[PDB]
Amino acid sequence: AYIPGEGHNLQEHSVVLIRGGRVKDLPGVRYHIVRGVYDAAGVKDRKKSRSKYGTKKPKEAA
Amino acid sequence: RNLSALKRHRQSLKRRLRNKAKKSAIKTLSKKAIQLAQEGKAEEALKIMRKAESLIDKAAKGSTLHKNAAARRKSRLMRKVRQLLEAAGAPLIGGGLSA
Amino acid sequence: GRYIGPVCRLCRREGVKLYLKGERCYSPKCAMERRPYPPGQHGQKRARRPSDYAVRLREKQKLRRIYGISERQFRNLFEEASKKKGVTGSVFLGLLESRLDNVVYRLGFAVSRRQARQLVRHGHITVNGRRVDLPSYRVRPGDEIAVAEKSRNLELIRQNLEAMKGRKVGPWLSLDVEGMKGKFLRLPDREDLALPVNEQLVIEFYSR
Amino acid sequence: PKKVLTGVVVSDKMQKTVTVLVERQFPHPLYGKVIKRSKKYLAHDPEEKYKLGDVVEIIESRPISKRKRFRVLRLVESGRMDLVEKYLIRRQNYESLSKR
Amino acid sequence: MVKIRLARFGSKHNPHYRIVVTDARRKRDGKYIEKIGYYDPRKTTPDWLKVDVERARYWLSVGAQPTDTARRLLRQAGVFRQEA
RNA sequence: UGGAGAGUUUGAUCCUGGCUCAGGGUGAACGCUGGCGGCGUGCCUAAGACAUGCAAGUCGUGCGGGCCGCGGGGUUUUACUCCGUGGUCAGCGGCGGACGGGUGAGUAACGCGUGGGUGACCUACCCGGAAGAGGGGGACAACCCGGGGAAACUCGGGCUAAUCCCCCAUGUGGACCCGCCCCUUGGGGUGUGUCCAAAGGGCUUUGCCCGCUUCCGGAUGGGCCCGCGUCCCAUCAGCUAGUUGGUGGGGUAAUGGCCCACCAAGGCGACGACGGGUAGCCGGUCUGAGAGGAUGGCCGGCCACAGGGGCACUGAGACACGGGCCCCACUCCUACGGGAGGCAGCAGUUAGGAAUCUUCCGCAAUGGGCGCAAGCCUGACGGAGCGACGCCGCUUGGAGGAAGAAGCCCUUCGGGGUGUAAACUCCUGAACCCGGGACGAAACCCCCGAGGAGGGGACUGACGGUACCGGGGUAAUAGCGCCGGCCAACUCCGUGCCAGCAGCCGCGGUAAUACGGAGGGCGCGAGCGUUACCCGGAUUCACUGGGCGUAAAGGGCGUGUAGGCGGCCUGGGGCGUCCCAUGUGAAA
């Protein structure tokens, strides 16, 4: 299981949501991780791929 | 806890009782009949085939042997007598017996 | 929700206006004549070679954009268009035009799409006895669009009908500024309503 | 009604009952060409009268025994030694296909 | 036992029953031997009623039984009437 | 009335071709955002185990009784009893429990779709038809006497009734038997001899209602049987001694070895037998121009299962989900002597999984079971609740509005953009306030006639005062993928083969249009992306619609079996084939 890229913590449980999709990297990359799940909740500050990259609605209060 | 499916098994026990006794009597009377007829006397076993006939009706009427079944028993029973009468005997008297 | 807001931003987007908003986007600009061309920081920075399929997508938009309806339902009544019988393209057009809201607009009760569909959803339209909100409710030959009784005493309705008198209605659109009505007569064709749009492009596109 | 079919008598070897090679053919629900097919049936002969070949019209009747379905009501031809020959050539082939 | 009954179809809050003969066992919105009529107690269409009294006379004359809403339907469709 | 292709193999072209994408869907799931309403849909996993509440009852027009109640009859009155008796509890008795109902485990099946045979058959609660309902007898409850025990319930004794069980009857008829006429698989009649009936209850009583006896005919469902089609592995090649067949028995409603006995060697197989993996089947469903592929959940039909297995019983019907017996586990109650239980019924707990809901209302409508009716059970059904899971409709506004403010993105300092968008303007008027207010249901029922047809009046709403009609009126949620070619849309800083995106090719190795940020714009919008599963493009298992000189591929070559197919001509056949009549193909 890979991950959704930048901004991780994960340590060793997380419930990494086995997903699915290799690339030209890590002879596997099948069954990814999701953030949000039971751990990770995305990049500390993300402004796009918040469909996996955790972050809710950047409510910058202004 | 409560369900009158106990009614079922009670009355049903009584009905099984009915079937048991009556059907049993049927089988045994049939057997005495074939015994006597096998010997070479007939007449008594034809009054016993009379009694038998009445009995197989008692079957037919009830929930024991249903109509056609009782009929089949009647038939086979009457059939076997005739042939095994001729065998060393001489069919003289007749009730369910036809000349 | 049906887009709304900065609208004739769409007008400039096509490169060809669509009245969309009356009194202004009909006056000396549908955001056009001021500065007519597709918006954004780019816009006036040399056009390209948009592919056939792509200018076709644009055409499909274009068409759905003049018909102030979600491309959702543009599509929906396109499925219904390819469903039953009728000259696919031109009949699809007439099927779009035969909708209560632009019936009310082209009648002249309203001054463009936004206003039209608003008034229509406001059930100010009595067709054959009943006021009907239901903007995407298409009428039938022999029916007639009317307006409510207290709605005879409405400001810009009166003003619309005032500036309307003299402006001859569509051929299938029967006017009636006396009985306060509008007979939905026959079923119009491309030569009854001409808008910068190709029917077969919408077919070919949607009917991939 | 009561479905019938003619058929080449195979094996008289059973007492008062013979087998019958019945035959049909039909095209292909996705491949044109008509295909020829075999299907054996039970030829019922209370008074043993049919032998090696005797093509007869045969009749599906009341369940006679274990798979003892079909019967006979009329003959057609006899001495089908050629057909029965081919049948037995197939049987030869069956006794000519060993995996052990 | 063969009875004549009603099988409602439609949706949630747009009733319309199928006036239809069937056997006792046959469930409601299920299967029927033969269909003869329709009845919608809602009254939104002037065609809220239809009775195929011909085959109804068949079923009645061949050993079947009616229902209650039937009772209404029969007394209101000449199914009962004997003219004279 | 129905067919779009594209990227990726080179220096460059072409061909074969694989991968990938654009696409459509779903009982979805996941993350991000989330307003109103309609119809749908909702354990896709462990056929893993369940607390509790309900789901099959009903009938006094079969019968006796308990005992609560009352006028109160009898007893002069008494103890109290005792006649009528609403009741009320069980019992004996009667009908449903075999329908309603859920899952899919098994099952590759005469199970299912399908076409018929039954001269091999059953069919109750019902419509017609015929002969009718003579007389007598016995036994057990409930109840009264005693016991065991925690209960479960269990043991014995003593009585009463019956639409409870028998007895010789009465015998149109039905049943068998041996003959006989017609038939032709056991179809119908007929000559001889024997067997069978019946239940009575009600009342406006001399008549009917409800039921009963004997048969025939239909209405209706199924039993058996064949025809036919029915996943895959040939690295599953042989299989079989109840085995193939008969005679003679037994059994079922009945054909047949399904089982007894006795017996002659046969019964299937490359038309893929045997084996084993896998699987409910269908009317249908999604996709593709189509051929077809895949699929079968809500619904409708057929099957099968009842914690696993055996098993009978009862009966019109069962091997019987809320009936019985036993083995197996498994869990629970106890005083540990003993005993109980099955949510694959319905709501609800728990194991399980990324995920599949309320421990709700009414029998008012329909439908089922029972009752002469009044009526009664019905978690069937008919209604609200919850979840954007699906599809549909819908408000967040209209209209004036700047050479265009400022706020922020960009710059060659001239400005460009954002955007009529905003603000200011007037207009309407979701939400919401008051008022009235539904259809969904008129039959059943009593009454005139006769209890028939017909006629009249009257009773009957769970939703909910919700829908909707009238008036008063507030501008009142906006998100999700993207902007390297397929695929529509670029500018600015950072980041510097690092952090990283990626379905394909790949992109960054210190000026990235692919990362990441910010303005803008592409798409869609109460929704958008992601993954998974399925059909397509894939003409990429090619029948339409392919191929084997060198890309993947002739068997090293001759032989021959079966099989495949076949020269000219006449005529007979009418099997394949073609034509119209015609049965069915339900409903949806």
* Domains defined along chain D, listed by start: 1-100 (2.40.50.140)
> Cβ distance E51 to E36 under 8 Å?
yes
C11 is in an annotated binding site: yes
Give dist(CA C61, CA C58) in Å, integer. Answer: 5
Exposed, middle or buried, E55 (CB in 10 Å: 0-12/13-18/19+)?
middle
Way it was determined: X-ray
Q: How far in angstroms lies nucleotide F293's C1' from the CA of residue D24?
A: 30
According to DSSP H, which parts of chain D are helical? 81-94
Q: How far apart are CA C90 and CA D61, in angstroms?
A: 67
Q: Which of B28, B27, B50, B46 is nearest to B84 (CA)?
A: B46
Stretch(es) of chain C classified as CATH 3.10.290.10: 97-193
* Domain C97-193: CATH class, spelled out: alpha beta
**C-beta contacts of C133-140 below 8 A and 24+ residues apart:** C134/C100, C135/C69, C135/C99, C135/C100, C135/C101, C136/C69, C136/C73, C136/C77, C136/C99, C136/C100, C136/C101, C137/C99, C137/C100, C138/C95, C138/C98, C138/C99, C138/C100, C139/C98, C139/C100, C139/C103, C139/C184, C140/C184
Q: Where are the domains of chain B?
A: 1-99
Taking the alpha carbons of D2, D5, D6, D12 in that order, is the dihedral positive or negative? negative
* Closest nucleotide to E64 by C1' from CA: F126
Which one-letter amino acid corresponds to residue C193? L
Q: Which residue has the tokens 């209650």?
A: E68
- How far lies C129's CA from each of C124, C144, C147, C150, C181, in Å? 12, 9, 10, 15, 12
Instruction: State how far the Cα of C67 lies from the Cα of C69, in Å rounded to an integer.
Output: 5
Across chain D, which distance is largest between two alpha carbons, in Å? 48
Q: Is C101 annotated as a binding residue?
A: no
Could you say which residues 26-55 of protein chain E have a Cβ atom less than 7 A away from any atom in strand F? 26-33, 35, 41-43
**B1-99 CATH pick, 3.10.105.10, 3.40.30.10, 1.20.58.110, 3.40.50.620:** 1.20.58.110
Q: How many helices (H) and strands (E) does chain E have?
A: 2, 4
* Per-residue tokens: B93: 């008297």
Residue C183: CB less than 7 A from any atom in strand F: no
Q: Is C124 annotated as a binding residue?
A: no
Q: Is C4 left (phi over 0), alpha (psi -120 to 50) or beta?
A: left
CA of D34 to C1' of F397 (A): 72
Report, in ranges, which bases of strand F sit under 7 Å from a protein C-beta: 1, 3-4, 23, 30-34, 38-40, 56-58, 91-97, 99-101, 115-117, 119-127, 165-168, 174-178, 185, 191-197, 214-215, 217-221, 224-229, 236-238, 242-246, 249-258, 264-271, 291-292, 299-302, 313-317, 320, 322-324, 354, 365-369, 380-384, 392-401, 403-404, 409-410, 416-422, 426-430, 439-444, 452-455, 471, 475, 477-482, 486-491, 499-506, 515-526, 528-532, 543, 561-565, 575-577, 586-587
Instruction: Return d(Cα B42, Cα D16) in angstroms, integer.
Output: 38
Which residues are CB-neighbours of C22 under 8 A, at least 6 positions away?
A: C110, C111, C112, C115
**Distance, CA of E36 to C1' of F369, in Å:** 26
What is the CA E33 to C1' F343 distance in angstroms? 35
CA distances from D17 to D9, D12, D76, D82 (A): 10, 7, 17, 22
Q: Please tell me what DSSP assigns to residue C102.
A: H
Homologous superfamily in CATH for domain E1-84: Ribosomal protein S16 (3.30.1320.10)
Residue A41 CA, chain-centre distance (Å), reads 7
Chain B, 42-81: which CBs lie within 7 Å of strand F? 50, 53-54, 57-58, 61-69, 71-76, 78-80
Closest-lying nucleotide for C131 based on CA to C1': F469
Q: Is the CB of C17 under 7 A from strand F?
A: no
CA of B2 to C1' of F333 (A): 18
**How many angstroms is C1' of F564 away from CA of D61?**
36
Query: Which residues numbered 161-180 in chain C sit less than 7 A from strand F, measured from CB?
Result: none
Distance CA E33, CA E22 (A): 5
* Beta pairing partners, E5: E20
In angstroms, the CA C136 to CA C125 distance is 13
Chain E contact partners (≥3 CB pairs within 8 A): none
**Is C113 part of any known ligand binding site?**
no
Integer CA distances (angstroms), C66 to C10, C60, C71, C105, C134, in order: 9, 10, 11, 12, 19
Q: Are D53 and D81 in contact (CB under 8 A)?
A: yes
C1-96+194-208 has which CATH code?
Answer: 1.10.1050.10
Q: What is the DSSP letter of A27?
A: G
**Domain limits, chain E:** 1-84
β-bridge mates for residue D10, sequence order = D19
CA of A50: nucleotide with nearest C1':
F32
CA dihedral over A10, A12, A14, A15, signed as positive or negative: positive
Residue E20 has which token pair? Answer: 């239809």
Residues of chain C with CATH 1.10.1050.10: 1-96+194-208
The set of residues, in sequence order, having a beta carbon less than 8 Å from that of D78 and lying 6+ positions away, is D51, D53, D54, D55
Distance from residue C84's CA to nucleotide F540's C1', rounded to whole Å: 36
- Give every CB contact of residue C143 below 8 A, 6+ residues apart in sequence: C127, C128, C183, C184
CA–CA distance, C30 with E59 (Å, rounded to integer): 73
